[PDB]
Design a protein around this ligand. Structure first.
Ligand SMILES: Nc1ncnc2c1ncn2[C@@H]1O[C@H](COP(=O)(O)OP(=O)(O)OP(=O)(O)O)[C@@H](O)[C@H]1O
Ligand SMILES: Nc1ncnc2c1ncn2[C@@H]1O[C@H](COP(=O)(O)OP(=O)(O)OP(=O)(O)O)[C@@H](O)[C@H]1O
Ligand SMILES: Nc1ncnc2c1ncn2[C@@H]1O[C@H](COP(=O)(O)OP(=O)(O)OP(=O)(O)O)[C@@H](O)[C@H]1O
Ligand SMILES: Nc1ncnc2c1ncn2[C@@H]1O[C@H](COP(=O)(O)OP(=O)(O)OP(=O)(O)O)[C@@H](O)[C@H]1O
Lengths: 61, 61, 61, 61, 61, 61
């Protein structure tokens, strides 16, 4: 049904450290501040906006 | 749609070890835990969310 | 319009061996088993689900 | 749409030998047999189906 | 829309020499003849059709 | 509705220096002059139009 939002929501609520791999193979690490339909906000030392279209995978680190 | 979900649900139901090849050539392995319109869930040691847009092919390993 | 379905049907209906080139230069080969809006099913040694967004060209082998 | 369809139609109608550069760096050559919303059919020797999403540029050779 | 069409239209009416960078690092050069919703026509010697999906940046050169 | 728009707007309004990482690992730097649904205009020397589909991350620099 819907899997993406619960997975990301749960990762956020529980403040879980995640690795975000980009489609070019670059790995980003932080925690999920928020997300909407197109982007995921990732906090570490500064918050950065990652476009979903550039993401391959999100996995707990 | 009408071909994807059954293919994916069969693998999920039957606990088939699968290879997911990404568009960047990276090959991920595991079993399909779940999926929605946009993402596929692959389990072994951690559950990782893979965006379909980053996927090239899904195959039994 | 729709050019894609007939082209692929003809290959499926008539068991033409086909070479499928992916956006990362990799080339798959087999027989078009079926397809829907988003995926093609290559059947060769195995049934594999190829996302069309990962495909660059489809050529008769 | 209003610039793309005319551009492609002229090439097909006038039997112009074309070069289709793909995003992956491959260059396909041939004549445009036909096109629709999603693909271009490019001939010669055989007909090859090209997904527009894989194309960067289309130019007469 | 409120940003893209005015930017491109100004470059077109004013015949500004432009660099169009593709997502693969290819840099095209020319002037904008025309655009629609999906493509940009870039001309110097020969008008070439560039798909927007393959474009990263458009810059006055 | 948006997380994306507020994030980009705050950076724009406060002239916050940003790094825009493209999907091909190329890094752009500047200030966000403006944006719409599909593009971002990034300031000096000469403003350049960047397609969002080509962007991986926007980071305050
Ligand atoms: N789950 C994954 N999804 C997408 N890409 C991955 C994944 N795991 C690894 N990669 C990519 O494969 C390449 C090599 O993987 P590598 O094992 O170095 O990952 P790592 O996170 O750097 O280290 P490790 O996996 O040992 O923790 C890297 O470029 C990385 O981006
Ligand atoms: N169906 C596919 N879709 C996308 N990429 C693929 C596919 N099959 C292989 N590749 C990639 O193309 C390259 C060549 O494949 P090759 O068969 O040599 O890999 P391998 O190391 O033998 O093991 P594997 O094929 O299972 O990755 C590999 O880097 C692989 O990740
Ligand atoms: N504004 C831009 N948008 C997208 N790609 C660009 C841009 N500028 C340069 N590139 C690409 O980055 C690559 C770097 O090569 P080049 O030396 O020509 O540019 P560059 O000035 O090094 O770019 P940078 O220093 O920002 O990495 C080139 O392949 C080029 O096509
Ligand atoms: N936040 C980010 N988003 C996307 N790509 C990044 C990011 N940070 C780094 N990269 C990419 O990873 C490469 C090297 O990774 P690293 O994290 O070491 O960045 P860096 O080279 O130290 O600094 P910079 O990213 O400014 O080049 C860079 O070439 C860059 O393109």
């Amino acid at each position: 049904q819907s899997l993406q939002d619960p997975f990301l929501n749960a990762l956020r609520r529980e403040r879980v450290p995640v690795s975000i791999y980009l489609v070019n193979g670059i790995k980003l690490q932080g925690q999920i501040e928020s997300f909407d339909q197109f982007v995921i906000l990732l906090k570490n030392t500064v918050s950065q906006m990652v476009y979903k279209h550039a993401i391959s995978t999100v996995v707990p680190s």
